[PDB]
Amino acid sequence: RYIDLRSDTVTQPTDAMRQCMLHAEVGDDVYGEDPGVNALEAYGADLLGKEAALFVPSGTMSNLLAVMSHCQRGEGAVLGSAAHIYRYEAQGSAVLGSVALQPVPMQADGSLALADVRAAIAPDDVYFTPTRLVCLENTHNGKVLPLPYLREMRELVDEHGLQLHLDGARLFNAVVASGHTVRELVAPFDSVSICLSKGLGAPVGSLLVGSHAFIARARRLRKMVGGGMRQAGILAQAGLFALQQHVVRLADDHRRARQLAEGLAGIRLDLAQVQTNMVFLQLRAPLLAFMKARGILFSELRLVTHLQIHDDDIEEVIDAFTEYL
Amino acid sequence: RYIDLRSDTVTQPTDAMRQCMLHAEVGDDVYGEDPGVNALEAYGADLLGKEAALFVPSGTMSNLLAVMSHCQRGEGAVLGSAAHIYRYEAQGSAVLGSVALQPVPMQADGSLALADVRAAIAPDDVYFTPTRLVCLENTHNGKVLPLPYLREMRELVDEHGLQLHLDGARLFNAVVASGHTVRELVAPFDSVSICLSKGLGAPVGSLLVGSHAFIARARRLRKMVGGGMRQAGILAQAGLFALQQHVVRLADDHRRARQLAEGLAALLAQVQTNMVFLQAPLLAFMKARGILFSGELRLVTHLQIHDDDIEEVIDAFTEYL
Amino acid sequence: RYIDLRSDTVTQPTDAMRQCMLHAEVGDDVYGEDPGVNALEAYGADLLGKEAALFVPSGTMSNLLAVMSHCQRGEGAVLGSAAHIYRYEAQGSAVLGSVALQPVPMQADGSLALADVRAAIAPDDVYFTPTRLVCLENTHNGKVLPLPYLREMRELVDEHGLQLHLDGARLFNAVVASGHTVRELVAPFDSVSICLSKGLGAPVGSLLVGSHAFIARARRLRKMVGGGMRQAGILAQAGLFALQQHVVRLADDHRRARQLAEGLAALPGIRLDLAQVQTNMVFLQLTERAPLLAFMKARGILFSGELRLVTHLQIHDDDIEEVIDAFTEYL
Amino acid sequence: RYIDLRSDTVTQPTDAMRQCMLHAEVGDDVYGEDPGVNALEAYGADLLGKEAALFVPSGTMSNLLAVMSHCQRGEGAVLGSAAHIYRYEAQGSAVLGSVALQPVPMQADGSLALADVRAAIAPDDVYFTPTRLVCLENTHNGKVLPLPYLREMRELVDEHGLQLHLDGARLFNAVVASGHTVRELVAPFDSVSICLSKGLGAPVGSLLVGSHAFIARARRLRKMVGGGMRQAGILAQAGLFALQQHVVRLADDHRRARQLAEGLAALPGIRLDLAQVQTNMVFLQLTSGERAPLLAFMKARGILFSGELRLVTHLQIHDDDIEEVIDAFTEYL
Numbered sequence A: 001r002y003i004d005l006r007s008d009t010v011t012q013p014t015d016a017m018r019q020c021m022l023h024a025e026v027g028d029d030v031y032g033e034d035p036g037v038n039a040l041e042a043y044g045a046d047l048l049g050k051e052a053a054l055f056v057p058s059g060t061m062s063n064l065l066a067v068m069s070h071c072q073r074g075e076g077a078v079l080g081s082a083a084h085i086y087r088y089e090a091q092g093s094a095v096l097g098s099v100a101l102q103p104v105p106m107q108a109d110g111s112l113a114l115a116d117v118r119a120a121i122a123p124d125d126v127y128f129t130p131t132r133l134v135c136l137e138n139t140h141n142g143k144v145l146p147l148p149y150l151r152e153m154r155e156l157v158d159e160h161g162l163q164l165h166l167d168g169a170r171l172f173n174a175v176v177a178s179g180h181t182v183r184e185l186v187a188p189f190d191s192v193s194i195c196l197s198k199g200l201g202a203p204v205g206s207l208l209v210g211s212h213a214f215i216a217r218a219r220r221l222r223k224m225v226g227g228g229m230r231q232a233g234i235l236a237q238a239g240l241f242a243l244q245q246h247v248v249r250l251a252d253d254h255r256r257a258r259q260l261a262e263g264l265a266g267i268r269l270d271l272a273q274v275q276t277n278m279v280f281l282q283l284r285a286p287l288l289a290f291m292k293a294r295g296i297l298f299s300e301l302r303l304v305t306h307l308q309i310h311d312d313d314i315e316e317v318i319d320a321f322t323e324y325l
Numbered sequence B: 001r002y003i004d005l006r007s008d009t010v011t012q013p014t015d016a017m018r019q020c021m022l023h024a025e026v027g028d029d030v031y032g033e034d035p036g037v038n039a040l041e042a043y044g045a046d047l048l049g050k051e052a053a054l055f056v057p058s059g060t061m062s063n064l065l066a067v068m069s070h071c072q073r074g075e076g077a078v079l080g081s082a083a084h085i086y087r088y089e090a091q092g093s094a095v096l097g098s099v100a101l102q103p104v105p106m107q108a109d110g111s112l113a114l115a116d117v118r119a120a121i122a123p124d125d126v127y128f129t130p131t132r133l134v135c136l137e138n139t140h141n142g143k144v145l146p147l148p149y150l151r152e153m154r155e156l157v158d159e160h161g162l163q164l165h166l167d168g169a170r171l172f173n174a175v176v177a178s179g180h181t182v183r184e185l186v187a188p189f190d191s192v193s194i195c196l197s198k199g200l201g202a203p204v205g206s207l208l209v210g211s212h213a214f215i216a217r218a219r220r221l222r223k224m225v226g227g228g229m230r231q232a233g234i235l236a237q238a239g240l241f242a243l244q245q246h247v248v249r250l251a252d253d254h255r256r257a258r259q260l261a262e263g264l265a266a267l268l269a270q271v272q273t274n275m276v277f278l279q280a281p282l283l284a285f286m287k288a289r290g291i292l293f294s295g296e297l298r299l300v301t302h303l304q305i306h307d308d309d310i311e312e313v314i315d316a317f318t319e320y321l
Numbered sequence C: 001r002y003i004d005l006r007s008d009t010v011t012q013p014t015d016a017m018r019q020c021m022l023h024a025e026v027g028d029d030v031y032g033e034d035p036g037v038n039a040l041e042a043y044g045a046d047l048l049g050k051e052a053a054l055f056v057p058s059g060t061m062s063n064l065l066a067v068m069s070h071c072q073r074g075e076g077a078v079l080g081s082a083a084h085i086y087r088y089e090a091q092g093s094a095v096l097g098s099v100a101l102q103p104v105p106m107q108a109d110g111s112l113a114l115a116d117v118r119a120a121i122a123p124d125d126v127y128f129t130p131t132r133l134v135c136l137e138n139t140h141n142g143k144v145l146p147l148p149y150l151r152e153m154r155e156l157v158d159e160h161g162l163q164l165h166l167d168g169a170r171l172f173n174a175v176v177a178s179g180h181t182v183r184e185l186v187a188p189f190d191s192v193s194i195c196l197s198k199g200l201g202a203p204v205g206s207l208l209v210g211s212h213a214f215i216a217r218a219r220r221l222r223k224m225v226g227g228g229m230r231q232a233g234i235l236a237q238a239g240l241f242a243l244q245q246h247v248v249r250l251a252d253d254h255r256r257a258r259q260l261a262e263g264l265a266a267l268p269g270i271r272l273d274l275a276q277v278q279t280n281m282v283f284l285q286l287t288e289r290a291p292l293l294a295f296m297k298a299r300g301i302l303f304s305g306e307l308r309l310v311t312h313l314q315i316h317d318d319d320i321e322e323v324i325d326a327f328t329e330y331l
Numbered sequence D: 001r002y003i004d005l006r007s008d009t010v011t012q013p014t015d016a017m018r019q020c021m022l023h024a025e026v027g028d029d030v031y032g033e034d035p036g037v038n039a040l041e042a043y044g045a046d047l048l049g050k051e052a053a054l055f056v057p058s059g060t061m062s063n064l065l066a067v068m069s070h071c072q073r074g075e076g077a078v079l080g081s082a083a084h085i086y087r088y089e090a091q092g093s094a095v096l097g098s099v100a101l102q103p104v105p106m107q108a109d110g111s112l113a114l115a116d117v118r119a120a121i122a123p124d125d126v127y128f129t130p131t132r133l134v135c136l137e138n139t140h141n142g143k144v145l146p147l148p149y150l151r152e153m154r155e156l157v158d159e160h161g162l163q164l165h166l167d168g169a170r171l172f173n174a175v176v177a178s179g180h181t182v183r184e185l186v187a188p189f190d191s192v193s194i195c196l197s198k199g200l201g202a203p204v205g206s207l208l209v210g211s212h213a214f215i216a217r218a219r220r221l222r223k224m225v226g227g228g229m230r231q232a233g234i235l236a237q238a239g240l241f242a243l244q245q246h247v248v249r250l251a252d253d254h255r256r257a258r259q260l261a262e263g264l265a266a267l268p269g270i271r272l273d274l275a276q277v278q279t280n281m282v283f284l285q286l287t288s289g290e291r292a293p294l295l296a297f298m299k300a301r302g303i304l305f306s307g308e309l310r311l312v313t314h315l316q317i318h319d320d321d322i323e324e325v326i327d328a329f330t331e332y333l
């Protein structure tokens, strides 16, 4: 028995979810003949109020396809320096996609300073290959992107005729925490990546959502990168289950994280950045070893709660920290 | 309700396979903690007599990762012009991996002429970025590569200190049909891609097999291309089931494929496994008879094609004249 | 004191050409303010009957910029397997430009079989990133591309909505040899690369010619690859000189190459196809290559799978007779 | 004639340089048989105290080849966000070379904070393709990179097993201004790009300098990108002339830049930091008023320069030219 607070990616499929997977109807998705994948994508597109959706094996591929579908060779994509697309995806957009990544300083709430983005945007000129895309992240390290800011960024992106992509790997965490609908949070975006394999608890994959044309380009690029699966409907049906059954209960992950951060408050902790299911802490190797020895797992120290974290688990790791001091 | 001879990719997971998936133990594969994936990779590496294995969502990615792990920016990979990596994978190796694809003419048996490969190989020179890889395909359009040729190609690549990669998407078809063990057919290769999502009947994915160092590079690139999954043990366990339970019965696909070609004696040396090649109005009639298939017409048999299906499509062809 | 038959690239600038360079007016080409470059480009574009032209340090960059301006990421370019763009430019179009190179068998006259090309073309589909370009080469190994063939390829390219690019590194050799003007030979093409640094005798560079939009893309890509020079008018003026003064005399290079092939095809032990001598190249085989090259090099005679001898303005009549004697001496 | 303070790239070849070009011996550089190019490369490599040198048509290609020769596919190169390699070369190293560019904040003197560099460095790992290169710039917007800082960065890169590349497009400006020789200033670097087509006054090209192995790779990539010229010895000999004859006189460009800046900073409506005038550049902003009306006014009087107004001095800028644009500014304000 381990208390795994390393990430919400360690979520296991519930028995009800496994049961759903057992009876999932499948087909060849390359021929577009998997009813499970078709259902998830149809449901996903409508849920976010967009035209089309595309199922992919990972959030990394979801973003990778997103940037390559917005930007061609040499074209620019502006994003945060602390964004996952920049920091934790091996710069695949540049290395594989020949896209010019244009990092700008990222703020606490995950916002990019309008002045920084505007200064970063390169025009379509004689010697300048134009910026084409701006990327945002919601949530960003468990923090919710403020909606008034989002509207302003949409305005800036429109001013230069650019596109707007959302890394919403933990979008529904922002939905539940802020109290705004998913429609309201993705309305200013042209494209959205949502991960099904974190808090939502599905075992594999993410969904890329956007316009028909955008998704059409992403689907062709998905084949090239190796994302074109066959009978993925079993996976897709699990992802569909997650969206229908595992969104509301995310509030508990937020509560236990809030309850965890409060208890841990020799530990420096800012409760203002505990807005969803993450707790960031600062005082390292002896601590991790100590915790490891007590069946407690995490990785600035980051603690993430999920559906396989329970009330007693929280109290055990609060005890463990107290004991450590 | 349809007789689907389009591809062996339309294979559905058996109920027994679904049960295996239901009870599969999983974990976060990125942390390497998925017991289902680890088991498949361990079994696969051992089955082919290699050091390590890597589970990926598709055969396209398996090959894509393979040449990029063999060939760095500007470096060359020699393969067949009719090879899947060249013709049917959007040249991802070049576009994404900056690898110089070096297609050579493909022979009847699916082999690459030794003279062509020798002539294609570019040395490590002042203005030449060296060829680093040679790719083969077994099977290729259902045809089995002769083993003496395989050992011989190994000799050629060794002569230039190169690597040898096998697209064995349909390797086990070649195993069953030729009568050689899997070990004998993958021995000349440095790396092997085997597809689990075709004849073997698993719903998703392939296995890339090779040395520890090679797979280590492939595993790093898998993360970049977006192949890094979480609880893929459910998928992996199905792949494990397929390898353990669905290899022997591939002979039936070969039997039904051969009997199909035999039946088309109205109005054959390339029928060695589960494919039948023949040379729009035709498609309309066949579709109307619940018959689905795909310049040259390709008919593919698999575990959801039965004896009555075969004679039914033979009847359609005869009736069509 | 060497007889250099290795290539027509070893051509040195004449004193007249040097004088022209000395008095060349220059400026910052990045600002488009070099009168020498602009003059060469204006003249070059007009000579080939296209809208715009771009001066580049090499024919390799000329072709590299050409396919990348025709083909974006993942898009396809059909070419000959023996074409320079495929065989001798390190596949930069693919490695650097993410262009899908699509080789088809290349014939003797440099033509690509329409059936082979038609079979290679990938449509704009759900899973197929479209072919966008077909590349041809004139001359190809000193051989002239047949003009009737071009019209038919032009037909095919229009039928599939593609572009057509000509590697005319030695185009003016084909002009002199065939008796057709340069305009007639580039008319079916959307874009043309011509090399100034071979038979024409300019010391550096090539010209990429095409539409305004195409060149605009090529000019921006030139900056990225590092081809954007400053006061290149000195080089450009030499190229203008070459185009104005060194085209007609290519007939002599062809004559000396033909007389060379005649002399060597008499000698026993020599295999030589005189039908392949149409311009300034002689391809030959012994009935080993390396011992011959060392033997020739020691006698101040330089050339290079198949033995290739290339004539240019620094080859004279006596030079031809000396290497004929040398082969005779060697055999 | 125009008084062109837009850039030092507009430098024209002197008659002496043109004479040198006329008598330049040439050959096919691809065969390595151009005596003019070989001489320039030999002289240049020794001048910077490195093993080998490579002649290229531009500084962009010099840097482009540099990063790709240090960094393989997916590998990382750390540089300044205000560095030319990042901002003004279309990210060719990334787009063409598949190199992961890693910008960090760049300071006034062109230095990168070591803490920022340490945070940027990715190790050779199971999932991070390692950083391989750190890039610096001297001069940077005409500022001179402090040598003690350089020593510290060398320590950092050795500690992490990285390479160090200098964009020394205006290195010799830093040489004259700081009083340190070119050898001392490039000693900590593994590779150096020097531009011949600016202050040095040669019409075309740059030199990439480094180890034999590094240059051998660069020479191969040069062929691929299209930098392999034939008889470029005429250009190279001009570059050789520039290095031998036009380095010392860079001090005059610096004097005229300072005299220019002093005259303009004595005018109301001008914001000018005289501490940022260390070489041949003067950066100024109006306090206030738009930039474009000033430029149009100046252009109409045969005066040319260029977000922030930048004035660059060179060998075709003379004292009377300087006094004339001060008068024009005075007249305009």
Ligand SMILES: Cc1ncc(COP(=O)(O)O)c(CNCC(=O)O)c1O
Pocket: A006, A007, A008, A009, A057, A058, A059, A060, A061, A063, A084, A085, A137, A139, A167, A169, A170, A195, A197, A206, B228
């Ligand atoms: C914000 C964000 N975006 C994209 C991804 C990539 O998704 P995949 O890992 O499914 O490719 C992650 C994964 N983040 C892992 C973690 O936070 O532990 C993420 O946190």
Ligand SMILES: Cc1ncc(COP(=O)(O)O)c(CNCC(=O)O)c1O
Pocket: A228, B006, B007, B008, B009, B057, B058, B059, B060, B061, B063, B084, B085, B137, B139, B167, B169, B170, B195, B197
């Ligand atoms: C020999 C071969 N190799 C690789 C692949 C690609 O694998 P995925 O499709 O799983 O990515 C295929 C697909 N072949 C499809 C067919 O023959 O119908 C194939 O036939």
Ligand SMILES: Cc1ncc(COP(=O)(O)O)c(CNCC(=O)O)c1O
Pocket: C006, C007, C008, C009, C057, C058, C059, C060, C061, C063, C084, C085, C137, C139, C167, C169, C170, C195, C197, C205, C206, D228
């Ligand atoms: C047909 C053709 N096209 C393009 C090029 C490339 O041009 P540069 O070498 O200027 O980059 C060459 C060079 N051919 C050299 C020879 O055959 O000797 C060529 O022969």
Ligand SMILES: Cc1ncc(COP(=O)(O)O)c(CNCC(=O)O)c1O
Pocket: C228, D006, D007, D008, D009, D057, D058, D059, D060, D061, D063, D084, D085, D137, D139, D167, D169, D170, D195, D197, D206
């Ligand atoms: C610091 C620096 N680095 C590299 C380059 C590129 O060199 P080429 O322009 O020769 O490619 C320049 C040109 N800078 C032009 C200017 O500042 O006006 C530069 O100033």
